[model samples]
Target: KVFGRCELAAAMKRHGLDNYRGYSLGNWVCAAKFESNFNTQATNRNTDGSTSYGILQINSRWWCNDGRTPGSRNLCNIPCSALLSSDITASVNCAKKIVSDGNGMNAWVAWRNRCKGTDVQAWIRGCRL
Candidate 1:
């Protein structure tokens, strides 16, 4: 649905993600790409029965509660379904808090698996953010 990476970068900048906390715009962009490919309705059932929901793929284990994920921490105090939407305000805010938990982007397997290296600049190619 996103025409290009610029949309991701621009929207991130507008939402103050250009240099949020200790993560870069590229980090966020890459996470979005590898996580859900920017699809807000994106949802995946993990092997452990925990579901990753929304654009950022916040897991049900320690981020949200949907009444089905056993032992969910609900750290964000929001429904897991709340993350499944086009508006990313809650997702962004939750991400900010999640990053502040001392692990930064380490909270996301997508970040560690796909964007661990410092070669994510290409994600911002022509973006003005």
Candidate 2:
């Protein structure tokens, strides 16, 4: 079953992104949809023969460095399973850090303003905070 807002919010709290309760979830969901179609187990094989795995489309090969070895910390260590564990907020927060290095939410702010029809802010505003 797909996760809901509360579940996602709790996940975000776990990852220290509790500040993203209101309009931020909208941008988070939009990013997730655009990145991996919200597939928690999503993996992408780049044309260069590289791979990005998990809900946030994390390129474990590039970001985690665990992909080259077996039994090493994979994307799971970066919160992949947390995203899949019905905690979308945590997943999104992890993705934010990976993508923006603690400023990922800033990217969302910019995206929300630029991509008006994308429903990023609308989603956040509509969600029950």
Candidate 3:
């Protein structure tokens, strides 16, 4: 998997983030907790025949194609497995793109539901911000 509480926070602090359209590192980390518990291999099957993959749960509908699915937007142009790796670079880059698309963190329904108004600082407590 990718990270736990502190490691994920530190990694996001060190590299993977700089606020995509005002979406902060806190939102990133908090969402991951509910999304995949920071496990890169996390997978969830949706009711609509779309599957979510990776730590960030990038869906097969619009971001990455899982090969088993058709009509995926494939905006990231990588396999869904790419996001399901220990390397989160691909997932982070796609998250940036997803936010930049004007949906912001709303693209991640989990973030809007569980993290939007929660204590963001709690996600990165003890990490050097």
Candidate 4:
């Protein structure tokens, strides 16, 4: 599994974030785990058979109707190819932006808890975050 601690840290720094603590890491990991189980090579085939690829689960093989390039799902615009090219840290950084852009930590925390095979929401509530 790709643990994106370093990548997330670097991304935070690039975004002018200097106060990220362990809880931020926790949230990032939680979201990535939930999205793609930390697999940088992971891909998901949609109902229409299009594919979402890489650690942040970017839909690299299809057009993103959200106006984001399939390569720029993450805020860093690292591109899907770079994300799947073993740059595990970049992948994590991408996922971090999703949470950091004011979406809250609940989604990621929930994912981490659920991936551990527990009730996610309740577990996140107990986290210091």
lDDT of each: 0.85, 0.50, 0.84, 0.50
Kindly list the per-residue Cα lDDT of model 4 for residues 33-109, writing each as its tens digit. 66776667776665644456665565533323223344333345545566675656555465456546554444344
RMSD of 2: 5.5
Off by over 4 Å in 3: none
Poorest lDDT segment (10 consecutive residues) of candidate 4? 60-69
TM-scores vs. true structure, each candidate:
0.91, 0.55, 0.93, 0.46
Give candidate 1's error at residue 71 in angstroms.
Answer: 2.3
Model 2, backbone clash pairs (residues 3+ apart or across chains), number: 2
Which portions of model 4 miss their true places by more than 4 Å?
1-24, 47-51, 59-75, 106-129
Candidate 2 on 59-118: residue-level lDDT in tens?
Answer: 544344434533434433553334444445555555655555544444333344544356
The ten-residue window of minimal lDDT in model 2 covers: 103-112
Cα displacement (angstroms), candidate 1, residue 55, comes to 1.0
User: Which regions in candidate 2 have their CA more than 4 angstroms from the true location?
Assistant: 4-10, 13-23, 66-93, 102-119
Tell me, what's the RMSD of every candidate? 1.5, 5.5, 1.3, 7.3
In candidate 1, the residue pairs with backbone N, CA or C atoms under 3 Å apart (3 or more residues apart, or in different chains) clash, namely none
Q: Compared with the true structure, what per-residue lDDT tens digits does model 1 show for residues 32-99?
A: 99998888888899999999988889989888898998877999999988888777877887888898
Q: Which whole-number lDDT from 0 to 100 does residue 28 have in model 4?
A: 44
Best TM-score goes to which candidate?
3
